[PDB]
Amino acid sequence: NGQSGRMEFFWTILKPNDAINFESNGNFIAPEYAYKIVKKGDSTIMKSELEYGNCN
């Protein structure tokens, strides 16, 4: 995509009441938005080319 540079992303799960500490000096790509895990349960990531069908 026209770039010879590379971007490398990382992640962690930050428990409630815990904190995450960044320090940097360059080349940092900082967080803006993050995700609360609001509810957990059974799901899956299906691989399908299809789109939504209005059904149950």
Partner: protein
């Protein structure tokens, strides 16, 4: 098949008996007719129904594939994941197919058994008060009306009550007509 009754010494079934799997055809002066044996038919239905439910139920827990993804240097565990998941599909497929085949045999032989046993219920009731014809039928040595027919079909046939009439007939038969 194994018991030699269905499509054996009784050759072919009755298109005109609709209210059961096994039963009777009777024939006397007052006519003819078909009649299911309710009790054997119900036991058969009970039997096959429990069997099918038991098959469904035992296959209830059984391997359920899950998608897992792997990167370009996890080719070995990606393969081990694939073969493993395939490994179970094959086992269960074998289990299902072979179960169907073995139980179909059992089911078909089950029915054969039910008909033999029904014939034999009649046989050991009548004894020499009737003549075994060899084709699934009995020919009485005495008159057996619609009421008497019902007694046979439901276990109530009284042998001593007709035994006298039977021995008298056998004597005429011996003279040759």
């Amino acid at each position: 098949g194994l018991f030699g009754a269905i499509a054996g010494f009784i050759e072919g079934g009755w298109q005109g008996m609709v209210d059961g799997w096994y039963g009777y055809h009777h024939s006397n002066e007052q006519g003819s007719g078909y009649a299911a044996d309710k009790e054997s038919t119900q036991k058969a239905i009970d039997g096959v129904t429990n069997k099918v439910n038991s098959i469904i139920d035992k296959m209830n827990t059984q391997f359920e594939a899950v998608g897992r993804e792997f990167n370009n240097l996890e080719r070995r565990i990606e393969n081990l994941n694939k073969k493993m998941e395939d490994g179970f599909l094959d086992v269960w497929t074998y289990n299902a197919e072979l179960l169907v085949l073995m139980e179909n045999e059992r089911t078909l032989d089950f029915h054969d058994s039910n008909v033999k046993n029904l014939y034999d219920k009649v046989r050991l009731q009548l004894r020499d008060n009737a003549k075994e014809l060899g084709n699934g039928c009995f020919e009485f040595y005495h008159k057996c009306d619609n009421e008497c027919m019902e007694s046979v079909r439901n276990g109530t046939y009284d042998y001593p009550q007709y035994s006298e009439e039977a021995r008298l007939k056998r004597e005429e038969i011996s003279s040759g007509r």
